[PDB]
Design a protein around this ligand. Structure first.
Ligand SMILES: [Mg+2]
Ligand SMILES: [Mg+2]
Ligand SMILES: [Mg+2]
Ligand SMILES: [Mg+2]
Lengths: 6, 235, 235, 6
């Protein structure tokens, strides 16, 4: 699981 | 440049076709041409611009990370010497990535940001400025501190405007907070700030959901789930 | 060209890095440079060349199909007129795809095929020649018949050599048959030939599996399953 | 399901 950016 | 002879509307039409064909380099070139026509961008047009470059730079960043990992392993104790090729090719990908970031930052500086007066456009563009300085920071190894502070400064101006001018559920406000939180966590070495920002942003949006339509609720809760995922990952 | 100053071995090393980073345009450019050094290619090097261009042209073909479908819908009864942009952009993608096919065919003609004397290399390169003429045929609408016959002729020479010089389980022989069968089905309007070729190829490989090691058995049965999938789809 | 080439 990798952190989210958008 | 090469898009100077094509109609603005045709560039936007072709950007949408490129998106359907997953031709994101083409999409970015079309939207660059549209920006260079000199007129402000609509909400939909701003999102075509961001989708295009996010996909281009996303592939470059993923490739850079693969190559940087190979390079680091090659400098471990006991690694056989293989010559300059890994470094050279990482540098090649790095240079192309920096060029894309510079291109986006140049569009924002000439002259998207200075013409953007509504909160929705100004915050969107300053988030983009922070994002692309952050991508520069990811590969930076004399100017790293100034690159980092340029990202921080853009994000902070966007945060200030978004808190004053937008509801806490606004999807742009939420995505700005998401990304500035990641900046704190993995660029600025400030995980506590990252966690505080994500949790406060989440809680203030939760408390405003009751004001929203079904469609707006779906839009906001989608981004809220990204904030929650990061908090779960970090705690 | 641009790779003329880089060592052959460095180009191959960088092609393998590009593959790991999923940078297939770079990978193709590196292998083009390696071919242009003028030495024959090893088995591994031939497969780097094919992997690179198959991925580049694969993306172009997928984009072309998306755009061609939009274009056809725009010429249906009752479709609102939207101007020349769909056609223009389909033509742009088509032209770039043709350029890649021409580049590969040029490498084969100068001078990979004429130097290739072993069955494994000669069949591999003639399969490639047939494949890239087939990709040209997919988008061709005065020369379509000659493009089709150039694909057929390359495939037929490869088939003749493969049947004489290779066992029926050879993975190159199997993949050549797979693709020539698809050529029959969807380029040459010969579905019965396509089905006959796939079934005969499958049955003759099945009967030779007993001669193989565990590793060779896995290699051959993998391609045999692709033949079977096509037969199931077509019958 | 689409036909295979390799
Ligand atoms: Mg005009
Ligand atoms: Mg304005
Ligand atoms: Mg040399
Ligand atoms: Mg020879």
């Amino acid at each position: 699981n990798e952190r989210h950016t958008c | 440049g090469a898009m100077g002879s094509m109609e603005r509307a045709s560039l936007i039409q072709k950007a949408k076709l490129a998106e359907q064909a997953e031709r994101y380099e083409d999409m970015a070139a079309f939207m660059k041409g549209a920006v260079e026509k000199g007129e402000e961008l609509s909400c939909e047009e701003r999102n075509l611009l961001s989708v295009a470059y996010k996909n281009v730079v996303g592939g470059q960043r993923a490739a850079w990370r693969v190559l940087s990992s190979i390079e680091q392993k090659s400098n471990e104790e006991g690694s056989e010497e293989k010559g300059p090729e890994v470094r050279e090719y990482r540098e090649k990908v790095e240079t192309e990535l920096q060029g894309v970031c510079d291109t986006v930052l140049g569009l924002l500086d000439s002259h998207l940001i200075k013409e953007a007066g509504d909160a929705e456009s100004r915050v969107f563009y300053l988030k983009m400025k922070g994002d692309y300085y952050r991508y520069l920071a990811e590969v930076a190894t004399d100017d790293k501190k100034r690159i980092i502070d340029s990202a921080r400064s853009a994000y902070q101006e966007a945060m200030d405007i978004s808190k004053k001018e937008m509801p806490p559920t606004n999807p742009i406000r939420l995505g700005l907070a998401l990304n500035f939180s990641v900046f704190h966590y993995e660029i600025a070495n400030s995980p506590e700030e990252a966690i505080s920002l994500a949790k406060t942003t989440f809680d203030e949006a939760m408390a405003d959901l009751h004001t929203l339509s079904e469609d707006s609720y779906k839009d906001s809760t989608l981004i809220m789930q990204l904030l929650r995922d990061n908090l779960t990952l970090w705690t």
